[PDB]
Subunit: 222 residues, 3 copies
């Protein structure tokens, strides 16, 4: 299409589609109820991302937001994705370590706040206020990372896989607020097409990369 970022939306669509079918095939067989849990969560994440990448690709998940006196192309479908996929990702971590329900409700709700205030910031028409919402969302993100490091003595295999995915998570998720801040939603330093490339690489790694690590682990079986 006439949108230079179309290629990264097409590649993301394809890669999420392929990871979904890979994980669906892979989880064929599985009878351990525990493993079943991780397969369901982990397959749903890129299936949802597939649909929202495709909706961006076809033009549906894009809207024009006037701010700084200009019509800014905002991809809102990313927040409908993340709204569901980022808690699912947290549930995978949480189940690995047998978290208490209170800690899981803390994580999912901080996550909701993170994404929803990101969305409000994305659609806010007063430029300066966009970054107030960014800050609040970032603070929710930092709470989540805090809990992942300080909020949890288990089978060695659980701990090891949990520690790797936790590290993957902090590194990748921490990049999203930066991208947003310097990209088209924020200061407009980085053009939309490079931004969309950046988010494609992060999303595939955080979903399909993460899930390959998890689902090859015997940490997921009782």
């Amino acid at each position: 299409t006439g949108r230079p970022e179309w290629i990264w939306l097409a590649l993301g669509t394809a890669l999420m589609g392929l990871g979904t079918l890979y994980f669906l095939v892979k989880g064929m067989g599985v009878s351990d109820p525990d493993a079943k849990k991780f397969y369901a969560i982990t397959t749903l994440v890129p299936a949802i991302a597939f649909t929202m990448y495709l909706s961006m690709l076809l033009g549906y998940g894009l809207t024009m937001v006037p701010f700084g006196g200009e019509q800014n192309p905002i991809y809102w479908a990313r927040y409908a994705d993340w709204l569901f996929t980022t808690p699912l990702l947290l549930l995978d971590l949480a189940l690995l370590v047998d978290a208490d329900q209170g800690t899981i409700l803390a994580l999912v709700g901080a996550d909701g706040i993170m994404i929803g205030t990101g969305l409000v910031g994305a659609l806010t028409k007063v430029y300066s206020y966009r970054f107030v919402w960014w800050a609040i969302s970032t603070a929710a993100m930092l709470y989540i990372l805090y809990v992942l490091f300080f909020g949890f003595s288990m089978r060695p295999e659980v701990a090891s896989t949990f520690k790797v995915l936790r590290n993957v998570t902090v590194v990748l998720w921490s990049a999203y607020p930066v991208v947003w801040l310097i990209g088209s939603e924020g200061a407009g330093i980085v053009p939309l097409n490079i931004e969309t490339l950046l988010f494609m690489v992060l999303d595939v790694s955080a979903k399909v990369g993460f899930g390959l690590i998890l689902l090859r682990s015997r940490a997921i079986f009782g």
Copy 2:
């Protein structure tokens, strides 16, 4: 009103209203926690459907979608209904057979995908792409039906009621993609008023019919 389909929206409103009050009365009494579960789920389904039928009846759940160069009347409130009532229906089936949580999360999330891509398809302004979303949604539907048949040795009474509702479910839910495809959201072969009649008959059967079968069964008690 000046909408010929108004009569089927009024009858659906009434029938869902009546089934809700019937099931509410009926579940009066119930102390078995298990039965309580099925009554809550099963009463909520047509109560939600009541509200969305009424919102269509009064004009609120209808929007104009330009496509094939025309203003197409799309009832979006059906997807707000289904978004909640179709997972609830799946939960009823799932609890009957004591499904593993992983299988329940698979079903609810495939269902979310089904309805949400149905909604995107319903509101898409590029005619051809409407049917890409239809296909993806249908494939989610076929996954759900697959799991209901191949994803689950229990008390004979559970199995029997489970098998009847499962059959009811596959037959009725399978008709929805057809109706959408030949009706006003899709190829426009069947006029909106007949379409609305068709969806009224399916919805009442899938909700109030289904629930009468379930809630008369002693399969719902421990």
Copy 3:
């Protein structure tokens, strides 16, 4: 700002912000998984309310709804708040008394209905029909209050705290339909700025007041 109600939106923002940080600090320490549950729920409630008060304050959570041939300023962000915070409040009550899951699903779903039909009523452009949605929502509210009084012999300490919060809940929640009815969403008897003051006082009491009562109780510990 040029909106007279701005001061009560600023004070509500501040008070919800402060209660969130108070409860977050307070729950620092807590290891009892049960207590952890109540802290998560109870801290999330005013954190969510903080974000929606701030979105009203900045103008984002406000839209113009034409009815009775006039552009009525409707704060829709209250329903995005309540959609999540009112079930959370019910979950706090429900967990205190060890409710059956069927009763919890009844409460959360009646609550969803309550808020969602409130939202539909708030955005309905046919004046008379606004109050049909009000009535349906009120009837959901009365079901919830009914269940809180007649739907539940435990540790004396649980019962006592449960009875106080239950009383707090019925009194405060019952005022909301009245405010809506006489205020800008309804009959327009009470100006928007006084209405916004009223909702600020109720919300802070129902969230931050309620939570102070709960989280000082040893009813929350196993």
